[PDB]
Amino acid sequence: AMRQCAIYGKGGIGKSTTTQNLVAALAEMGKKVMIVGCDPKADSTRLILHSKAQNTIMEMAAEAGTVEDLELEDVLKAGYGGVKCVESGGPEPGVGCAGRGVITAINFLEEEGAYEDDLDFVFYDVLGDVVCGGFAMPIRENKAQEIYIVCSGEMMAMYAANNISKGIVKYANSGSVRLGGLICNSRNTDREDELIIALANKLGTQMIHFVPRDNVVQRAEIRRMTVIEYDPKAKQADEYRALARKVVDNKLLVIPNPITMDE
């Protein structure tokens, strides 16, 4: 029943706001879902959880001092709508590899039995700014079967979306990892959609959906809650609903044709 999706993008473009709101929609529909944050930001589980902060697997094991000497109930706490929320956490800046803490944490959840719990979906908020070994790790192992890239009309967003594609192409031989769609988060740009669909087409994948830029989101976030939860009545509430139905509905996963700088 379970499918794995990785939300990837440049930071500050809405991967987290989007992953949480969409998960809320899947929750509302009734599908059990778990959110693993691989982003160091750790604001990945903040909306569903009504928490200023989620203690991470990396932060917790440090005090205990060892992995597997750490209890799962403590590590993962269920959110609104019953979505299990967890943060990988990561190393202190300047020491080792950040992306690694991501690996230690996922392997932690698997031994501990979070998966095969009959969760309908699993979502990893992964930072798409840099694709290198620690962060392209969910890609190496088939941690995220479906990769959806949040992207905007901006240059870093496109280049980053394009770089994540390169990551998916390299692990084409090794697993089942695939690129599901491109989710355009609006930047209030002039012709943002035609530009993303321009990118979506050149890359071999469709833009699954266009998210409107709106105020209710800002308001729901200060309230420390998701737009779906803060305002079910609202239009923006309706958009994330559209985004979620679409991820459940979309049947096309493809290995991307990364484009040139020039195209």
């Binding site: 992995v67 080792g96 590899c97 690694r100 690996i103 230690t104 620690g134």
Partner: protein, 522 residues
């Protein structure tokens, strides 16, 4: 089935008919083995010249190497020091392997410890393991000194040894004053010899670097001897004995002989003998420092010449008649002590053994391999014996060294068919013995298999292996032998002449076929 009166071990138990039938059934039934004719066709192919070319054409695959990694070199050197525990920073499987490789060759216990870095330790760094490891190791084994070396996992992730060790002391895990010399020892770079060189320069550097003003050269009137990576006890023993015979005062830095040779008297000794910390601190006060195996002692030569200002003499490893003479004369010049009557008699005897055994030894063809100093020393000696070394292979050797050896071969009319190969494995050598055949092979136990392959081609094509070198695992107590000095030369000469005579006897033992030459007196 087993007769209880004479029980059969694997061999010749599996030689029994029920077992032979079973194996054949197994081979025919499930193995899907290539026909024997095909296996034969392929085996005859590898013995050829055509195959040697494809084999020597390899740029990425190494088969049957004649070299080992750096930490092995580091652990052995750390063993040379008193009450010193070798400690390797990095993963544990390496330590198990070093202890076992050493245990088998020396048939003695080998003490070594690891900080046990894991997958998790890979992301964070080696800092916790180093503090706990240093603290646990000291509490448990009570070593006076702990010498750190590192495994490749540690080298690739980049843990800083100096920073980790200082923070361990700073944080209070181990005393500030407790000695903790450390050397980075990447397995990808070099060999165990380089690993040995690094650990030593590090130990020497830790003890002598901060205080050099007080030190004055030649003040203590002893000569420092640095052995290098050595697996023969006789060698540590012989160097000390001669200096002692000569009356020369000396300090052997890194002497692992007592510990690798402790007596079974009912009590287990983790630590025995070793080079003292004070011996190491007072080292710069020596008249001079002599390096026994200069080829792998390059880093240490730089530290000793530059920091201690000792003018290290250029001397080859004291093997053979000429190099031993040179070492002794040199010690005589540095010490100021004369070469005694006793030592001159020994040299006399070596020559007498040489004159006595020259006809059997003359013209014999040998294929040999080893570490560069030892190989170099052996090649020089064989030429001194008039033997012909056809194939010389040093896996962990270099261009300068190869140049040095060719020079040695050029000096002797004997080294005419001789060729030096570096960076080539035993698989390469197997091809060489098959294409151009040496009378004998001088090397470690890894050559037992090359010999097996040759006998397979035929009796006449077999090249018997003569074991001198490291590691030797199929014979017992050979590590008690000596290769250095006159004594070492005598041991090597007796083994070679007797290996040659032993073989002649086997060849002439057939009744009424070849026994006409199976002589009582040879």
């Amino acid at each position: 089935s087993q007769q209880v009166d004479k029980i059969k071990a694997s061999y010749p138990l599996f030689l029994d008919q029920d077992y032979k039938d079973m194996l054949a059934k197994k081979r025919d039934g499930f193995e899907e083995k290539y026909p024997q004719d095909k296996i034969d066709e392929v085996f005859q192919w590898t013995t050829t010249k055509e195959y040697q070319e494809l084999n020597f054409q390899r740029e990425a695959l190494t088969v049957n190497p004649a070299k080992a990694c750096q930490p092995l070199g580091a652990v052995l050197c750390a063993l040379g020091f008193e009450k010193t525990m070798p400690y390797v920073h990095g993963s544990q499987g390496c330590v198990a392997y070093f202890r076992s490789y050493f245990n088998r060759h020396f048939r003695e216990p080998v003490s070594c410890v690891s900080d046990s870095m894991t997958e998790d330790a890979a992301v964070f760094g080696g800092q916790q393991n180093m503090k706990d490891g240093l603290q646990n190791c000291k509490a448990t084994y009570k070593p006076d000194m702990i010498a750190v070396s590192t495994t490749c996992m540690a080298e690739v992730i980049g843990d800083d040894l100096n920073a980790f060790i200082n923070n361990s002391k700073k944080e209070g895990f181990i005393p500030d004053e407790f000695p903790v010399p450390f050397a980075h020892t990447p397995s990808f770079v070099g060999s165990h010899v380089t690993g040995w060189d690094n650990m030593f320069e590090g130990i020497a550097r830790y003890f002598t670097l901060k205080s050099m003003d007080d030190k004055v050269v030649g003040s203590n009137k002893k000569i420092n001897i640095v052995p290098g990576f050595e697996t023969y006890l006789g060698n540590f023993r012989v160097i000390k004995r001669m200096l002692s015979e000569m009356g020369v005062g000396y300090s052997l830095l890194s002497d692992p002989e007592e510990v690798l040779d402790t007596p079974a008297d009912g009590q287990f000794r983790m630590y025995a003998g070793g080079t003292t910390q004070e011996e190491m601190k007072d080292a710069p006060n020596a008249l001079n420092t002599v390096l026994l195996q200069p080829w792998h002692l390059e880093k240490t030569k730089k530290f000793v010449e530059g920091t201690w200002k000792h003018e290290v003499p250029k001397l080859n490893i004291p093997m053979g008649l000429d190099w031993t003479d040179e070492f002794l004369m040199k010690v005589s010049e540095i010490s100021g002590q004369p070469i005694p009557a006793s030592l001159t008699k020994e040299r006399g005897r070596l020559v007498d053994m040489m004159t006595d055994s020259h006809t059997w030894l003359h013209g014999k063809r040998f294929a040999l391999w080893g570490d560069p100093d030892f190989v170099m020393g052996l090649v020089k000696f064989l030429l001194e014996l008039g033997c012909e070394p056809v194939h010389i292979l040093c896996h962990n050797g270099n261009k300068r060294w190869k140049k040095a050896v060719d020079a040695i071969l050029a000096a002797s009319p004997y080294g005419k068919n001789a060729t030096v190969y570096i960076g080539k494995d035993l698989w390469h050598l197997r091809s060489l013995v098959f294409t151009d055949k040496p009378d004998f092979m001088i090397g470690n136990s890894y050559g037992k298999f090359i010999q097996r392959d040759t006998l397979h081609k035929g009796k006449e094509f077999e090249v018997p292996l003569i074991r001198i070198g490291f590691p030797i695992f199929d014979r017992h107590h050979l590590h008690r032998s000596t290769t250095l000095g006159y004594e070492g030369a005598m041991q090597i000469l007796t083994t070679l002449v007797n290996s040659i005579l032993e073989r002649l006897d086997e060849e002439t033992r057939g009744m009424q076929a070849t026994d006409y030459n199976h002589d009582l007196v040879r």
